[PDB]
Amino acid sequence: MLELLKSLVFAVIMVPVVMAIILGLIYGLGEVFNIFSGV
Amino acid sequence: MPNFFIDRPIFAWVIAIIIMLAGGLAILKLPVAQYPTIAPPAVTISASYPGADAKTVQDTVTQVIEQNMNGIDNLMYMSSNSDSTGTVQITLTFESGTDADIAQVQVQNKLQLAMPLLPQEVQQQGVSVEKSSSSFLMVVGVINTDGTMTQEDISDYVAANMKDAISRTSGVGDVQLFGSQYAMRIWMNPNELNKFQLTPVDVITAIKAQNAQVAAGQLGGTPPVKGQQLNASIIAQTRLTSTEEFGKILLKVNQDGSRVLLRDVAKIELGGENYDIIAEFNGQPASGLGIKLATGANALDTAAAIRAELAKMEPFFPSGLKIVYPYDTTPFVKISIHEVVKTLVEAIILVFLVMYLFLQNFRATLIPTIAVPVVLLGTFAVLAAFGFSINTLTMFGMVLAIGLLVDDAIVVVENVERVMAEEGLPPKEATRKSMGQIQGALVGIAMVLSAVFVPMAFFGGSTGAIYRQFSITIVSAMALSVLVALILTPALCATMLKPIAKGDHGEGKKGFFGWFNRMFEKSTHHYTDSVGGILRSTGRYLVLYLIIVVGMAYLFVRLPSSFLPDEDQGVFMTMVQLPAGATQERTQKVLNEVTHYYLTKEKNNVESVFAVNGFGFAGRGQNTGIAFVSLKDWADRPGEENKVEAITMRATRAFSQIKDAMVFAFNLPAIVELGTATGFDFELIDQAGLGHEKLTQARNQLLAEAAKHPDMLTSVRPNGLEDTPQFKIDIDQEKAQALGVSINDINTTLGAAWGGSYVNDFIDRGRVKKVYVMSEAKYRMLPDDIGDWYVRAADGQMVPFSAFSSSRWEYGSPRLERYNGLPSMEILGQAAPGKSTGEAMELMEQLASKLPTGVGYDWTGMSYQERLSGNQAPSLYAISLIVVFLCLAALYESWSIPFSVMLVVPLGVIGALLAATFRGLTNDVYFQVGLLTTIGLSAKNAILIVEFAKDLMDKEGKGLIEATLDAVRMRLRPILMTSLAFILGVMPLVISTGAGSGAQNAVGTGVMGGMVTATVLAIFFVPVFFVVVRRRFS
Amino acid sequence: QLLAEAAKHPDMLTSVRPNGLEDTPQFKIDIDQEKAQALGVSINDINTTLGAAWGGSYVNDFIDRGRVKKVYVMSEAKYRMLPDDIGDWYVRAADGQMVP
Amino acid sequence: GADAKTVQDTVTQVIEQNMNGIDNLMYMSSNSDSTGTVQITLTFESGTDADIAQVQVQNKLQLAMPLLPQEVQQQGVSVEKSSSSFLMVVGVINTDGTMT
Amino acid sequence: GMAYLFVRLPSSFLPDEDQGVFMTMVQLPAGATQERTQKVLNEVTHYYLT
Amino acid sequence: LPTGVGYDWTGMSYQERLSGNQAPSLYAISLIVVFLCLAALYESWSIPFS
């Protein structure tokens, strides 16, 4: 009920932000590695 | 195998049904306990010598016992504690894994051969052997709230009408009583004894003669005369059954009818066996019971039965009595089960949501939801079959392995879905091709996980069992998951998939799905071109790898190490040690002060104080005291300022002002069975036969020397009692003989007047109880009182005790200790809040090296376990390394390719160390397990990537760079999905507030760091290792 | 009551019997320790005499044909058959006179 | 010397209290006679090894010895794995009547 | 019909078989001596052997 | 009987009660395992049901 609803809403608001940070590291590492590779 | 079961879905369904039935049967019948048998088996022998000082008990009792207890196999170490009260305790701790039910018989049988070699008094009291490594399931305190009943009345009521019923329920093992039942006390009176010309030996003889049972026989005897018809039993004199009957015992009757009665010379009452321990619950007199769980029994059911049985008895409870539960362990098990259920439900919902987000197909989402519970039930069945139980560690392993099950399901489903999308074939052939391509990788990773987790179970000692639970659970889960992925899942991919057309990956629809697919494809293209660019070069990132390696090594060296984190159990101990010579009154005053402080200045935190006077963990006596403070539920203690640590720090800071007492407060270890204090135990042993004064001086010098480094050693305190003044009575033997007084009479009078003698047994209200004889307080309480006693000479006159005896003072130790047969003393204390235990151990060894020659050092308790890390030497990690190397070389034919796979291992260890350093947690068992899990996950990702690249390179003619780029493009969605699932599922472990949250926090932090860093730094690095290995070893 | 009720159905229950002896009368010898001590005898002598005469007291062992067997001491049948026979036994007092 | 009431009151009460708790215990039943002898039979769950069962029974019994009455402590408490019904009774007779 | 006949059928544990030996227990009135028990046993054995 | 007095079978009767109280579980488990074996072996859920 209330605990189930709070667990669901927390999961659905936490998945997209976490995926956002993970894509952020993907972007950042890709760019820095591209910059460093060409020296 | 997978294609074989693809054509036969119901064969896999039948296997799944069998596994589910086995899991249900296993969960129906399985023992439940807080912890497994972690502590080593231990047997304690207890003997009592009433009214005897430490030296008499040490030489005359425990010397003979120690001498005759040699030859017992699997013995680890023995310790012995004597006391001035008259109690001696010998604790023998054996090796781990041995059957205690045979060692107990061995020690008992060896003891029974030394019984006739002991004095008569200890034999009459009797010695008892028991198992101390059992742990208490609960303690039930019973209190009086009006003032009628005293400690003795309550203890007898418990022993009579509560002990039997509580012991006779289901699942209850040993039941211990913290009090003593009644005993007829006979208090003499020297004035009255002198008045009637009597001595205590006369009273003893009269009691022995008039309180005996005689076998009268039988009317109409066994050989009958010819013609007998009557037969019955003769009931002659029997044991006396009342105080009024004991008061009518004759002592001296003349022929003219004049008589002396026992009541005329002494006071008869009903008291306790020993008035040494006074227990007060919240200021009221109280008694207690200790219930231990029997082996192979359900904890929750036993607790519920105990509560129901106790609640049954209130109508028959006499006067004003109340039942309380100061300490029970069921809430921890209930919390563990609740956490397991919550983690399972959260993982299922989360994986369904992420599959709907990515694969956009409900039929794909529903596949794992009917596969993970099958593996869970299979793990339950296998764990039940092996012989394990439902502890607080096995369920932790299960919540850890949920991620592995989700990973396997994600890998299989995503591979089949992408094959269908990029091939256009329908579920059947696509599933066949995907299973044929991935079966070898699945078998290889299963073997790798088994090889990396099995050797952890070969540890010895407590660490051995702690690692064994997790290792067995993890390997069983991995095996069941890979078997399920081989058998059940391919059928699901065969049947429950919709054959959509190629190109309809959501790009034909708008909203969140099409847009999200758009950035996903854009980011995938960016990542692929970036990794191609970085793979164009080789030597630029080798320096980055070396930098990561050296940073990880520095973090590993810097991180402090410990054994097991402390936890908020809601109960903590407070110890009071008065100065030498202090009596019970001052101890009671200090205990009352402590109770008042706890119940006044901490009303919102504490719940009850169970003060005990006369007994302490250091040593029993009228000088020490203990108090077990229990707190309210964790729901009512929010924040980190209302936990055990803050409470005990504030308590000791406040108690520092208590004069005439060094009151300390501390928290018991997380595993109560192993040790009683949270710090190391260190023991100094005499070897050159120096004695006691030299040992005491050496100990004091060592304590002062260790106190000079207040940076890594804290609360370094002795575990014994300091020497005390003693009273010495010297009897002039020739003066006593000249006056006509026998030495036997003097010795008996002195031993039965001041020490108290146990005479006979009697039947009270239908039970057996002892009868004790001792003087009446006021006549045995000061040295001058020794002159009030009179002894009868041969002539019939009474001579005072002061006419042939002298007196003087001396110094004596009230507590003598022995270790392994040699005199020894113990120092117990913890380390600094910001340093490792091992460094403190090494510095303590160096300090002990400076001791005067003739004194050695040793470890005991958890310290010994901490010294059992010789198996934790690289001799085992290297074994695991070669085993996994052999497994990897066997999976794919190469002696050099597994190097690339192993190069990914540090990339998760670095993140685990980063998380540990950020949170500040120490290197312990739970962190080690989490680190191993992260290593396994990173190895799994590396295995998948390398296997796909090798298959692309070999089966087709794809070049090195092209095949590597295609493989890393292909194995991107599964890796991200699995990483997201694991990271989001381990959120509660990191965010856990309390209720045994230390291990959860440690494991969650390690898992988070390892998973995040491995996911970030493996995709960019594994191809580099692969291409470098292939080109260098071309 | 259960036996009486179960005896009412011979068609199903046969030979319904208890398992154990029911109840027996017993004999109690009241020794007036006051009078015994006034006369001069001791309680130990009375107790030992009664136990050895009527109950029999195991004393010692002795070898017999290369085997160890016990020696028992007990009254001779005729004097331990009826309550009145308790009057046939005598106990030595303190001054040597024998009291019934 | 002790009758059924006092024997059942003293010895088997504490003995039965201590015996409970052994693993795979099916049921325990005790008898107290009038000659002073007392007997306790503990039947264990099927499949249990009788030898380790006797070992555990001895271990649990030796804890209750200090609580036991003084006389029985050196009387001899015998523990044995025994059945109920005789397997075979063999009789010896005299064929000439010269031996009673 | 199966259900009705299953309900009807009485239950037991194990059949009893002839073994060639059986037992007889004798309990006299309380307070009986050895002579009366010997007389009763003599009656029993005489009946059994005659 | 008057209140406070209970009964409990022992010895042979205990085993008789145990035998009579465990039969339905055995029947159900045997039927289930035979049905599952038939379904796994001869395919289809119609053949075992028939």
Contact between chain F and chain E (3 or more Cβ pairs less than 8 Å apart): yes
Q: Rg of chain A's alpha carbons, rounded to an integer?
A: 17
Q: Nearest CB to A34: which of B533, B987, B1015?
A: B533
Own/partner pairs, B788-791, CB within 8 angstroms, 24+ separation:
B788/B190, B788/B191, B789/B190, B789/B749, B789/B750, B789/B753, B790/B190, B790/B193, B790/B194, B790/B199, B791/B199, B791/B741, B791/B745, B791/B746, B791/B749
Burial zone of B809 (CB within 10 Å; 0-12 exposed, 13-18 middle, 19+ buried)? exposed
- E32 touches B: beta carbon within 8 Å: yes
Q: With an 8 Å Cβ cutoff, are D3 and B296 in contact?
A: no
Residue in D28, D56, D70, D75 to test binding to B, most B beta-carbons within 10 Å:
D70
C-alpha–C-alpha distance, residues B939 and B934, integer Å: 8
SS3 content of chain D, % helix, strand, coil (to 5): 40, 15, 45
Cα–Cα distance measured from residue B890 to residue B943, given in angstroms and rounded to the nearest whole number: 13
Q: Which residues of C touch B221 (CB under 8 A)?
A: 54, 74-75, 77, 80-81
| B739 CB neighbour count, 10 Å cutoff | 16
Task: Tell me which residue in B209, B216, B217 faces C44 most closely, judged by beta carbons.
Answer: B209
Three-class DSSP labels, B832-846: CCCCCHHHHHHHHHH
- Alpha carbon of B219: minimum distance to chain E alpha carbons (Å): 10
Half-sphere exposure of residue D33, counting CA atoms within 13 Å on the CB side? Answer: 7
CB within 8 Å of B561: residues ≥ 6 apart: B836, B837, B838, B922, B923, B924
Chains C and E touch, contact meaning at least 3 pairs of CB atoms under 8 angstroms apart = yes
Query: How many beta-carbon pairs below 8 A join chains C and D?
Result: 4
Sort out which chain F residues have CB atoms less than 8 A from D27's CB and list them: 10, 14
Chains D and B touch (3+ CB pairs under 8 A): yes
| Residue keyed to tokens 């008569």 | B120
Helices (H), B278-327: 299-312
C window 47-76, beta carbon within 8 A of B? 47, 50-51, 53-56, 74-75
The encoded tokens of residue B10 equal: 């119901």
Strands B233-235 and C26-28: parallel
- Separation of alpha carbons B816 and B89, rounded Å: 11
Q: Which residue of chain B comes nearest to E37, CA vs CA?
A: B229
Long-range contacts of B707-710 (CB under 8 A, 24+ apart): B709/B843
Give the 3-state secondary structure of residue B91: strand
| Residue corresponding to tokens 């069983």 | B476
For residue B858 the two structure tokens come to: 């040793």
Q: Nearest 5°: phi and psi at B669?
A: -65, 160
User: What is the spatial distance between Cα E24 and Cα B593, in angstroms, rounded to a whole number?
Assistant: 75
List residues bridging with B373 in a β-sheet: none
Q: Is D1 on the interface with C (CB under 8 A)?
A: yes
8 A C-beta contact, residue E17 and residue E28: no
In this complex, the chains that touch D, judged by 3 or more CB pairs closer than 8 A, are: B, C, F
Phi and psi torsions of B794, nearest 5°: -70, -35
| 3-state class (DSSP) for residue B812 | strand
Six token digits for residue B45: 């022998």
C-beta of residue B82 within 8 angstroms of C-beta of residue B127: no
Residues of A in contact with B345 (CB under 8 A): 7
Residues of chain C with Cβ-Cβ distance to B226 below 8 Å are none
Placement of tokens 């480094």 in the chain: B709
Are the CB atoms for B776 and B770 separated by under 8 Å?
Answer: no
User: In chain D, what residues touch C51 (CB-CB under 8 Å)?
Assistant: 1
Residues forming beta bridges with residue B286, ordered by sequence position: B143
Cα–Cα distance between D8 and B899 in angstroms, integer?
Answer: 77
Distance from CA of F40 to the nearest CA of B (A): 5
Q: Which residue of B has its CA nearest to D13?
A: B767
Output b/e per residue, B347-373; b: 16+ Cβ within 10 A: bbbbbebbbebbbbbeebbebbeebbb
**Best of E26, E27, E33 to disrupt the C interface by mutation (most C CBs within 10 Å)?**
E27
Q: For the stretch E16-44, what's the b/e string if a residue is b when 16 or more beta carbons lie within 10 angstroms of its beta carbon? A: eeeeeeeeeeeeeeeeeeeeeeeeeeeee
Residue of chain D with shortest Cα separation from F10:
D27
If we measure between CA atoms, which residue out of B100, B83, B155, B1025 comes closest to residue B538? B1025
Partners of B792 in the beta sheet? B798
CB B455: neighbour CB atoms within 10 A? 17
Q: How many CA atoms lie within 13 A of B586 on its CB side?
A: 17
Domains of chain B, each with CATH number or no CATH: 2-37+329-510 (1.20.1640.10), 38-132+813-820 (3.30.70.1430), 133-179+276-328 (3.30.70.1320), 180-275 (3.30.2090.10), 511-568+865-1033 (1.20.1640.10), 569-676 (3.30.70.1430), 677-723+821-864 (3.30.70.1440), 724-812 (3.30.2090.10)
For residue D65 the two structure tokens come to 């010895």
B221 touching chain D per CB within 8 A: no
Alpha helices by DSSP H, listed for chain A, are: 2-37
Interface touch F45/B17, C-beta < 8 Å: no
Residue B248 zone, left/alpha/beta (φ > 0; ψ -120 to 50; rest) = alpha
If you compute the radius of gyration of chain F from its CA atoms, what whole number of angstroms results? Answer: 20
- Residues with Cβ < 8 Å from B134, sequence gap 6 or more? B173, B174, B292, B673
Give, in order, the Cα–Cα distances in Å from B289 to each of B180, B275, B306, B310: 11, 18, 12, 12
Question: Does C21 reach chain E within 8 Å, measured CB to CB?
Answer: yes
Which residues of chain F have a CB within 8 Å of the CB of E2?
A: none
The ranges assigned to domains in chain A are 1-39
Q: Is it true that domain A1-39 has CATH number 6.10.250.2480? A: yes
d(CA B992, CA B567): 13
Residue F17 CA: distances (Å) to CA of B286, B566, D23, E11, E12: 45, 51, 22, 10, 9
The whole-angstrom distance between D52's CA and the closest CA on chain C is 31
Chain B interface test: which of E28, E35, E40 (most B C-beta within 10 Å): E35
Nearest residue of D to residue C47, measured between CA atoms: D1
C26 contacts D3 by C-beta, under 8 angstroms? yes
Quick one: how far is CA B410 from the chain centroid? 39
In chain C, which residue's Cα lies nearest the Cα of E27? C21
- List the chains bordering chain F where 3 or more Cβ pairs fall under 8 Å: B, D, E
